[PDB]
Motif scaffolding. Structure first.
Motif, short mmCIF file in Angstrom:
data_model
loop_
_atom_site.label_atom_id
_atom_site.label_comp_id
_atom_site.label_asym_id
_atom_site.label_seq_id
_atom_site.Cartn_x
_atom_site.Cartn_y
_atom_site.Cartn_z
N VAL A 14 0.82 -1.20 0.00
CA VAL A 14 0.00 0.00 0.00
C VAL A 14 0.86 1.26 0.00
CG1 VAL A 14 -1.98 1.14 1.06
CG2 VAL A 14 -1.61 -1.32 1.41
N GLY A 15 1.74 1.36 -0.99
CA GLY A 15 2.62 2.52 -1.08
C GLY A 15 1.96 3.69 -1.79
N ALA A 16 1.73 3.53 -3.09
CA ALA A 16 1.11 4.58 -3.89
C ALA A 16 -0.29 4.91 -3.37
CB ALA A 16 1.04 4.17 -5.35
N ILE A 17 -1.02 3.87 -2.95
CA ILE A 17 -2.36 4.05 -2.43
C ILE A 17 -2.37 4.96 -1.20
CG2 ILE A 17 -4.44 2.90 -1.61
CD1 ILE A 17 -3.53 0.37 -2.95
N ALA A 18 -1.37 4.78 -0.34
CA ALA A 18 -1.26 5.58 0.87
C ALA A 18 -1.09 7.06 0.53
CB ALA A 18 -0.08 5.10 1.71
N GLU A 19 -0.31 7.34 -0.50
CA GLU A 19 -0.07 8.72 -0.92
C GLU A 19 -1.34 9.34 -1.50
OE1 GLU A 19 3.91 9.42 -3.09
OE2 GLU A 19 4.12 9.45 -0.90
N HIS A 20 -2.26 8.48 -1.93
CA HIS A 20 -3.52 8.95 -2.50
C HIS A 20 -4.39 9.61 -1.44
CE1 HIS A 20 -5.43 8.96 -6.38
NE2 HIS A 20 -4.78 7.88 -6.77
N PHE A 21 -4.24 9.17 -0.20
CA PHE A 21 -5.01 9.72 0.91
C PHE A 21 -4.33 10.96 1.48
CE2 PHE A 21 -8.43 6.75 1.68
CZ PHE A 21 -8.02 5.61 1.02
#
Length: 21
Positions: A14-21
């Motif tokens: 959950v790397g890129a996804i985390a940055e989405h938040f």
């Protein structure tokens, strides 16, 4: 057939996804 394609998604983080938040 997909047994090897599905696992690939289960090994993903959950790397890129985390940055989405």
């Amino acid at each position: 057939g997909l047994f090897g394609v599905l696992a690939k998604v289960a090994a993903h983080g959950v790397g890129a996804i985390a940055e989405h938040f």
